[PDB]
Design a protein around this ligand. Structure first.
Ligand SMILES: CO[C@@H]1[C@@H](OC(N)=O)[C@@H](O)[C@H](Oc2ccc3c(O)c(NC(=O)[C@]45C[C@H]6C[C@H](C[C@H](C6)C4)C5)c(=O)oc3c2C)OC1(C)C
Ligand SMILES: Nc1ncnc2c1ncn2[C@@H]1O[C@H](COP(=O)(O)OP(=O)(O)O)[C@@H](O)[C@H]1O
Ligand SMILES: [Mg+2]
Length: 233
């Protein structure tokens, strides 16, 4: 499957925070949307996920233009999403966090939902936290729970907004292995970051944004032929 955004634009109070941003991700790839703070990465993700309406451009999955579908409809089409800031249900246990999303799985029986919850906790190394409250988790543990909770919806594409933000260096490596695992499972993975040097090496392709504009794109090697990108990073 392929998820594509074509010439997205978004304005707030007449200011164009995103002017022209495109990107594409296929199943089995990690693709980066990378650039400085304020460049428009989260706004772009919001327009892809459907959390805000787009002012221009197109959002496409395969042969379906979904630019006008609401968040919930795109989610059923296979788009999953993880915000930068903590999104775990702090007052609920890890188990209940996963079961909360598994309740939308009309393709699974009550029993199967229970199975998947145990499966996800094994995969993401959080079984020992089954009954712990999200509040009591560390940044890295919290991130692993939130990612597993997103996968509970069985998405085709997972959009991770700065997944490494607010986690320790050991958890960064752990999250990087998780991302490789997701990719190997056939998901299309789209990640944002401002640390181009670090994140570029895990991307099959990336889209470098600055001030709401796409300024470079392609494989890391292609991107790093751009003198501006070389220098700044
Ligand atoms: C049918 O409803 C479902 C639930 O399903 C059942 N059957 O209940 C379950 O799916 C679920 O539950 C949630 C989800 C979110 C919250 C939540 O954001 C809380 N607020 C805090 O964390 C904060 C907020 C402010 C003020 C303080 C400090 C800081 C900043 C963090 C508390 C919260 O206190 O409880 C939540 C619950 C229970 O979502 C629901 C509600 C849609
Ligand atoms: N709801 C909003 N109203 C007005 N301006 C906003 C809103 N959300 C974001 N912005 C602005 O849009 C620009 C891009 O923000 P954002 O997409 O969050 O950038 P990034 O994720 O790349 O840091 C920023 O200048 C930000 O202040
Ligand atoms: Mg952001």
């Amino acid at each position: 499957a392929t998820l594509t955004a074509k010439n997205l634009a978004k304005a707030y109070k007449g200011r164009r925070v995103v002017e022209d941003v495109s990107l594409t991700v296929n199943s089995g790839e990690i693709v980066g949307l990378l650039g400085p703070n304020g460049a428009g990465k989260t706004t772009t993700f919001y327009m892809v996920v459907g959390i805000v309406p787009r002012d221009a451009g197109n959002i496409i999955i395969d042969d379906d233009d979904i630019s006008l579908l609401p968040l919930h409809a795109r989610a059923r089409r296979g788009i999953g999403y993880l915000p930068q800031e903590a999104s775990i249900f702090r007052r609920l246990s890890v188990y209940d966090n996963l079961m909360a999303v598994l309740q939308i799985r009309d393709d699974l029986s009550a029993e199967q939902r229970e199975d998947r919850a145990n499966e996800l906790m094994e995969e993401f190394h959080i079984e020992h936290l089954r009954d712990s409250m999200g509040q009591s988790l560390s940044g890295g543990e919290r991130r692993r729970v939130e990612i597993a909770r997103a996968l509970a919806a069985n998405p085709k594409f997972i959009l991770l907004d700065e997944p490494f933000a607010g986690v320790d260096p050991i958890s960064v490596i752990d999250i990087k292995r998780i991302i490789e695992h997701l990719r190997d499972s056939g998901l299309g993975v789209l990640i944002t970051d401002h640390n181009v040097r670090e994140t570029l090496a895990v991307c099959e392709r990336a889209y470098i944004v600055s001030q709401g504009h796409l300024i470079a794109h392609g494989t890391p090697t292609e991107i790093l032929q751009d003198e501006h990108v070389k220098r700044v990073y």
